Curated annotation (Swiss-Prot):
Keywords: Flavoprotein, FMN, Membrane, Mitochondrion, Mitochondrion inner membrane, Oxidoreductase, Pyrimidine biosynthesis, Transit peptide, Transmembrane, Transmembrane helix. It is an enzyme of class 1 (oxidoreductase). It comes from Plasmodium falciparum (isolate 3D7). Its cofactor is FMN. Pathway: Pyrimidine metabolism; UMP biosynthesis via de novo pathway; orotate from (S)-dihydroorotate (quinone route): step 1/1. Monomer. This is Dihydroorotate dehydrogenase (quinone), mitochondrial. Belongs to the dihydroorotate dehydrogenase family. Type 2 subfamily. Its EC number is 1.3.5.2. One of its GO terms (biological process) is 'de novo' pyrimidine nucleobase biosynthetic process. One of its GO terms (molecular function) is dihydroorotate dehydrogenase (quinone) activity. Substrate binds at K68, N113, S114, C115, G116, F117, N181, N186, N267, T268. It comes from the Eukaryota. GO terms for cellular component: mitochondrial inner membrane.
Length: 375
């Protein structure tokens, strides 16, 4: 497309000269005024996938932390993605850590960030999602796109459960699934909630609050769940890769005891010490160097959960083959972040063709029969 052409020239200018967070907020602004390209094509019926009743028109979505406040959900989705995870959000708005907090190394296609959950807060983001849901009713191109909401806690909050429950009562009606963020490295002590006993109490409290949404309601299903599924939101949990194997196995059992709807693998890592551009900086590392660690973590959890917990893959997915390794290792869907940063408007259209081609040469009849094949 001609529209894809000029955006790649702008993109190459931005990654060379412009501050990373400025670039990001510029992307978001172009999305806010709806001047990004559209992918209007029908997605291959053979690359469609699902997690329980969530029907993804294609296997690629945008990961959390891209549209933290839900200011341009439509525009990002219309680039060719099947779903987006907005957030992570907190009950109260907060500025996050001191800038600059985002750095890119183009050479290794890697990002490091210490944002610290900068977001406008649950109430404002809830308004934003409601406006999207009203536009979704009236827009032909949005009718099957899924929107999940990643939720966390404010910096100074001590009871994470109090924060999670607040967000659910606010925004749960408008969400297709809820992602519990216990894996951010940039909010002190958050990843300590991954410990098995703590995680279990969190999951059950979240599920309890989602069930109580529908229990003082007087209106029909259609008018309570103002989302895409027309159902209560599923519950996923997003894990960090920096865990040991007995932590992984005890988490794995909590996810089955809780009957959690899915698992997002993985968040950023702190164990990448080999990028010179980054050797003084704070935060969690995204991108290509995170790929091999994520796929490994997927295989381990698919195994330790006896493949009863669907997986959403996150970590260094840039190519159709990258996606296929996530799928063969056990994932049903794939989330993109770094790919967008470094490849631009084209990421969805391109990666969908690559995996479409790759699924045929491998001899898979459709995507779903590739899930967990490495095992
Ligand atoms: C700037 C930035 C902000 C992020 N914010 C969030 C967030 O708010 N919540 C979350 O769960 N993950 C967040 N992430 C992690 C990504 O969603 C994703 O899991 C990670 O970047 C790995 O994907 P990738 O290698 O394809 O980039 C953020 C990542 C970056 C780089
Ligand atoms: C580079 C990038 C993009 C793509 C992008 C941005 C601007 C423009 C244009 F110049 F056209 F405005 C075109 C584009 F393709 C989204 N986000 C980021 C980013 O750096 N995010 C920070 C690292 C975490
Ligand atoms: O907002 C952040 O700082 C953040 C959250 C998260 O979950 N992962 C990440 O890398 N950064």
């Amino acid at each position: 497309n001609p529209e894809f052409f000029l955006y790649d020239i702008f993109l190459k200018f931005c990654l060379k000269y412009i501050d990373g967070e400025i670039c990001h907020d510029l992307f978001l602004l172009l999305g806010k005024y709806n001047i990004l390209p559209y992918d209007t094509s029908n997605d291959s019926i053979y690359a469609c996938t699902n997690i329980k009743h969530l029907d993804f028109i294609n296997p690629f979505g945008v990961a959390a932390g891209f549209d933290k406040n839900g200011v341009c959900i439509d525009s990002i989705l219309k680039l060719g993605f099947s779903f987006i995870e907005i957030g992570t959000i907190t009950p109260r708005g907060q500025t996050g850590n001191a800038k600059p907090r985002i750095f890119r190394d183009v050479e290794s296609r890697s990002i490091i960030n210490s944002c610290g959950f900068n977001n406008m807060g649950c109430d404002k983001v809830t308004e934003n999602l409601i406006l999207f849901r009203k536009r979704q009713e009236e827009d032909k191109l949005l009718s099957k796109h899924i929107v999940g909401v990643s939720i966390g806690k404010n910096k100074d909050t001590v009871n994470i459960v109090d924060d999670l429950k607040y967000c659910i009562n606010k925004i749960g009606r408008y969400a297709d699934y809820i992602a519990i963020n216990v894996s951010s490295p940039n909010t002190p002590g958050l990843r300590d909630n991954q410990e098995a006993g703590k995680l279990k109490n969190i999951i059950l409290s979240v599920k309890e609050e989602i069930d109580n949404l529908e229990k003082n309601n007087i209106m029909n299903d259609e008018f309570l769940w103002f989302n895409t599924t027309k159902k209560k939101p599923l519950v996923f949990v997003k894990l960090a890769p920096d865990l040991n194997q007995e932590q992984k196995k005890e988490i794995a059992d909590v996810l089955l005891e809780t009957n959690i709807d899915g698992m997002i693998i993985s968040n950023t890592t702190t164990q990448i010490n080999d990028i010179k551009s980054f050797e003084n900086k704070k935060g969690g590392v995204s991108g290509a160097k995170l790929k091999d660690i994520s796929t490994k973590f997927i295989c381990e959890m698919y195994n330790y959960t006896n493949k009863q917990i669907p997986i959403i893959a996150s970590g260094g997915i840039f190519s159709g083959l990258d996606a296929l390794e996530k799928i063969e290792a056990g994932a049903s869907v794939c989330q993109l972040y770094s790919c967008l940063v470094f490849n631009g408007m084209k990421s969805a259209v391109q990666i969908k063709r690559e995996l479409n081609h790759l699924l045929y040469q491998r001899g898979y009849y459709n995507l779903k029969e590739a899930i967990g094949r490495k095992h």
